[PDB]
Amino acid sequence: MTCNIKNGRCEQFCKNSADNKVVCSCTEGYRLAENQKSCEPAVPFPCGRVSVSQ
Amino acid sequence: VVGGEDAKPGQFPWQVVLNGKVDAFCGGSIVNEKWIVTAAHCVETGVKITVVAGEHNIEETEHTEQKRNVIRIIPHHNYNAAINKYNHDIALLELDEPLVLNSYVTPICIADKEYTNIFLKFGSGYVSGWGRVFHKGRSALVLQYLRVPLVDRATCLRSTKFTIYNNMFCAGFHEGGRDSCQGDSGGPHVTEVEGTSFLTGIISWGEECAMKGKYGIYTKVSRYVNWIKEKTKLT
Ligand SMILES: NC(N)c1cc2c(O[C@H](c3ccccc3)c3nc(-c4ccccc4)no3)cccc2s1
Numbered sequence A: 001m002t003c004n005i006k007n008g009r010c011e012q013f014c015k016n017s018a019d020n021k022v023v024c025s026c027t028e029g030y031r032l033a034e035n036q037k038s039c040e041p042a043v044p045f046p047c048g049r050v051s052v053s054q
Numbered sequence B: 001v002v003g004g005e006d007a008k009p010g011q012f013p014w015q016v017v018l019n020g021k022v023d024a025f026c027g028g029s030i031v032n033e034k035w036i037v038t039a040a041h042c043v044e045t046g047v048k049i050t051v052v053a054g055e056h057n058i059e060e061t062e063h064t065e066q067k068r069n070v071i072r073i074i075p076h077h078n079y080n081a082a083i084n085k086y087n088h089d090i091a092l093l094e095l096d097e098p099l100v101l102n103s104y105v106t107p108i109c110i111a112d113k114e115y116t117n118i119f120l121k122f123g124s125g126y127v128s129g130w131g132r133v134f135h136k137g138r139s140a141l142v143l144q145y146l147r148v149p150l151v152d153r154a155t156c157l158r159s160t161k162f163t164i165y166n167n168m169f170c171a172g173f174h175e176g177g178r179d180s181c182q183g184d185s186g187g188p189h190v191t192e193v194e195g196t197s198f199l200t201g202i203i204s205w206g207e208e209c210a211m212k213g214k215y216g217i218y219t220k221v222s223r224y225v226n227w228i229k230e231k232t233k234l235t
């Protein structure tokens, strides 16, 4: 598993570890979900999200 | 926006409108509660510019609006209209008082230089603003939006006698009809990624509107990511 294919399955950002693995990570306002892949809100109103239910 | 669609309230809560000599002469995107990123050509000296966030209908009262004054304006240091009118067309507006954030007033995300480029290459971004809705007619009451495809660089150079720099990209449809337009300038080009939108461009210029063979030209934000983050820091 690397960042080469499907962004390491990282929803936002992926960086190659030295152990031939992927460490995923998020943008500001977000935290890595217990998934270790998705990015979930870590603040009340994080950037780039629609939160008025459409 | 020519050939757009009505935005829903809360659909683009990073969008702001700019008031100056006339109301809604330009658009913007929220970087954070204290800062707004817009286009540099929208900055004319002597003009007090007022920023309005949480806007949907430009002549009604949603009671989601937050209006602020611009105390400091930082156009990009390489930007200079007398050398080129729209190269480095990006600028930061500092608000006197922080915006109070909610579902209607929410920042746009900004990745690093690399991921902003990657996200640009997804090939499709949502453009928005209250600019003209017909090539020469009238400005918009409700916030318009449009999902524009990335146009290839070689293809874009062929389209114009004017100079497209490496600080620019092009987006739009080959056979016209639908485009950003005058008044939309400084509004965001965003790319959505698994529910999260990321700022990939600034609406900047173009030769006429929605015309065949002519594409919109947007500021390549990836080239200015490091600058935006240096200047807009919070404490
Ligand atoms: N994505 C697009 N197509 C855009 C066009 C456009 C604009 O257009 C000018 C305009 C259009 C319609 C009505 C009034 C003014 C315009 N600018 C130009 C032009 C021509 C030659 C060189 C540079 C700019 N032609 O038109 C002014 C401000 C922003 C944008 S974005």
Ligand SMILES: [Ca+2]
Binding pocket: B055, B056, B057, B058, B059, B060, B061, B062, B063, B065
């Ligand atoms: Ca309103």
